[PDB]
Design a binder for these strands. Structure first.
Ligand code: ZN
Ligand code: ZN
Lengths: 200, 198
DNA sequence: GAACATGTTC
DNA sequence: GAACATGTTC
């Protein structure tokens, strides 16, 4: 349990996590690499994630975002904000979410922020909301308060976002995961990363 | 007093601040440019600074103190970037306050002073007579934050303000020079000295 | 955004 | 130490 399972498992309900493709326009804040199942996002800059459910789940069902290290070695390490930002004045003050946590859900007040005493694991749970009428997808806002190169945070260590569809009980109804990249230039990094990996 | 004066003023005694030249072998933990009166130093890697003196009324002591080179930022107080101030790697092991950028390695008689009115951080040590056969006294120094350290002096150059002053704390000597805690003190000075030439 | 700065890898 | 990684200046 302390190491959570990256492994995708879309539940009985179709569990789809989709990033509505950013505006094509030049200034991206979060481009997502379909090919790399990787998300390059600017820091503390809201990026939204869509979730598609083929069939409705029993109520109280909810979604848990959780960051973790890709590097097997680090998986053991807990994902947390870099102290330097953890106390940082600039955002702690706007947002009620605990400083430590990396993943902030933006725009929900039922958002529950979690530390697993057993695993000392950061996460943030929100209760599933019916996709807007005439709308396919329940969209969510996620804020990352640490760069991927944030030293004393996950310096230099890639991470995975584990979004799970869970019962109140906690039974896993479906999970999807992808690489994250909080950087300064999610654009450049994506292209270099794409050319860098694809051209290989 | 809030903005300490960069200006050099060797006094009655000849205040000699000098870095005995580094090995000249390829590896450079630290280097000091005499052209730019700038010192390049790897982080937290001990760097030795000596001083050559007229003997000075006892209790005289010497204080290092960092200040931003950029006028705009002289007002700001140089301090360890949180993410280091917290940092386990060295904050444990040494007895000096994490806040502090400059650490003196050799002494236990060193005092790390956080001014209440200015709020500035510096370390004061008492002058020791150069050891016999030694022309001058030599003080270890430790910088616990890269010159490019976020939440500290993340991008902004600094000057080390060294001064020898009496127990009264009056100013007897003073010299300052720019510092740059980097990861590659060598390439930097060559880049910077190279740059300046052209 | 391209030029630059600056830490890290192999 | 060269070549890569990555926030930052203008
Ligand atoms: Zn951070
Ligand atoms: Zn630091």
């Amino acid at each position: 349990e302390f190491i959570p399972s990256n492994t995708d498992y879309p539940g009985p309900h179709h569990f789809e996590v989709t990033f509505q493709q950013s505006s094509t326009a030049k200034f991206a804040t979060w481009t997502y690499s379909p090919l790399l199942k990787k998300l390059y996002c600017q820091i503390a800059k809201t990026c939204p994630i869509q979730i598609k459910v083929s069939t409705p789940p029993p109520p109280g069902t909810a979604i848990r975002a959780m960051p973790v290290y890709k590097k097997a070695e680090h998986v053991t390490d807990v994902v947390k904000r870099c102290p330097n930002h953890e106390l940082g004045r600039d955002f702690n003050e706007g947002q009620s979410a605990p400083a430590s946590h990396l993943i902030r859900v933006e725009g929900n007040n039922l958002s529950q922020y979690v530390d697993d005493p057993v695993t000392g694991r950061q996460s943030v749970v929100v209760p599933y909301e019916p996709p807007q009428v005439g709308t396919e997808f329940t969209t969510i806002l996620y804020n990352f308060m640490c760069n991927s190169s944030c030293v004393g945070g996950m310096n230099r260590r890639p991470i995975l976002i584990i979004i799970t569809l869970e019962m109140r009980d906690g039974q896993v109804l479906g999970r999807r995961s992808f690489e994250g990249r909080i950087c300064a230039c999610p654009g450049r990094d994506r292209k270099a990363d794409e050319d860098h990996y694809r051209e290989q």
